[PDB]
Structure formats: structure tokens, C-alpha cells
Amino acid sequence: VNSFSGYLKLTDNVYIKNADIVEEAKKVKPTVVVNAANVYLKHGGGVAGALNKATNNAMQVESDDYIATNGPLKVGGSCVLSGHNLAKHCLHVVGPNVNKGEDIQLLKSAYENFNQHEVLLAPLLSAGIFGADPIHSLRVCVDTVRTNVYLAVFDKNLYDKLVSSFL
Ligand SMILES: C[C@@H](O)[C@H]1CCCN1c1ncnc2[nH]ccc12
Numbered sequence: 001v002n003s004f005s006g007y008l009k010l011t012d013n014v015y016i017k018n019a020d021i022v023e024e025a026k027k028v029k030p031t032v033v034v035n036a037a038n039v040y041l042k043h044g045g046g047v048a049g050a051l052n053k054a055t056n057n058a059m060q061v062e063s064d065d066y067i068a069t070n071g072p073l074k075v076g077g078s079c080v081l082s083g084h085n086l087a088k089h090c091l092h093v094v095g096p097n098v099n100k101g102e103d104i105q106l107l108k109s110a111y112e113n114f115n116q117h118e119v120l121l122a123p124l125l126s127a128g129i130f131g132a133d134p135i136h137s138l139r140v141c142v143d144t145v146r147t148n149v150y151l152a153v154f155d156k157n158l159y160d161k162l163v164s165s166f167l
Pocket residue numbers: 019020021022046047050123124127128129134152153154155
């Protein structure tokens with residue numbers, strides 16, 4: 001039993017809700033919140049910009065130190081940093097950016113990072129400003145993640161479409 005509430009169940013291990021991930025995180029304070037990061041951990045907009053803003057820029061300060069020490073992430077890769085006031089940990093995951101010509105096959109590699117954590121609150125990856133089709137992102141998620149994932153979908157119309165077309 002966990003404290004996530006109001007989710008539709010898609011499969012044994014994937015749950016979905018029309019919600020702002022920032023609000024879900026503040027309410028639930030999960031062990032892991034996933035950020036839709038870029039390789040530079042520059043949290044400018046979308047999920048990352050909103051999460052960082054909710055931390056009063058502490059996420060960005062921590063991230064800049066991470067990059068100064070370690071260099072950029074790989075597309076498809078991840079790192080575990082603090083969750084600040086939103087969660088115990090933040091798993092920063094880089095999906096491919098289709099607007100940059102990055103290989104959509106890397107979306108599966110991105111989702112594989114979720115399997116290192118028993119339970120996560122997450123957005124769909126590579127959608128939003130990253131350019132990919134959220135319907136495809138959901139199928140990759142369901143077919144790749146085996147741990148328990150609670151997906152927060154910001155837009156109501158998209159949420160309704162993802163549920164209605166789910167095979
Ligand atoms: C797929 C879509 O859901 C992702 C990509 C674009 C924004 N977005 C978000 N999802 C969940 N919570 C959010 N809070 C703020 C933004 C946001």
C-alpha cells in the first residue's frame with residue numbers, strides 16, 4: 001500500500017492520473033520523482049522548469065555542481081540527485097529530443113532507468129518540449145518499466161486520449 005490516490009490502473013505496475021507532477025510531488029512526497037531532464041541539467045521549462053521553480057532554484061544549483069564535476073549525461077541516461085522539498089530523491093532522466101534529431105529508440109533506454117527504483121512518480125518522457133508523441137511514450141513505458149510507476153499527465157485532453165486508446 002502507498003499514498004498515491006486517484007490513479008487509473010493501466011497494467012500490473014503502471015498507473016496514470018491527470019495531474020501536475022509538481023502538485024503530486026508536494027502532496028505525496030514520494031521516495032523518487034522523475035525529472036524530464038536534458039543532458040546539461042539545464043532546467044529551463046516544461047517538467048524540469050516547473051520542478052526546479054518549486055525548489056526555489058535549489059535543484060538548479062545542485063545540478064550545476066553535478067555537471068561541473070561529472071560532465072553531461074548521456075541521452076538515455078540518468079542520475080540520482082536530491083528531491084529537495086518535493087521528494088526524497090529526484091531521478092533526472094534524459095529522453096531523446098526528436099527536435100534535435102536524437103534517436104527515438106533511446107526512449108526505451110531512458111525508461112530502463114526507472115527499473116532501478118521500486119516506486120516512482122514520473123512524467124511521460126520525450127513528450128512535451130522534447131517533441132515525441134506521448135501515445136508512443138506511454139507504450140514504451142508500459143513495455144519497458146517493470147517497477148511501480150505513477151504517471152502524472154498535465155494536460156486533460158492528452159490524458160483522456162492516452163486512456164481511451166490504450167491497448
Ligand atoms: C507529457 C506532459 O505531461 C509533460 C511534458 C510537458 C509538461 N508535462 C508535465 N507533466 C506533468 N506535470 C507537469 N507539470 C508541469 C509540466 C508538466
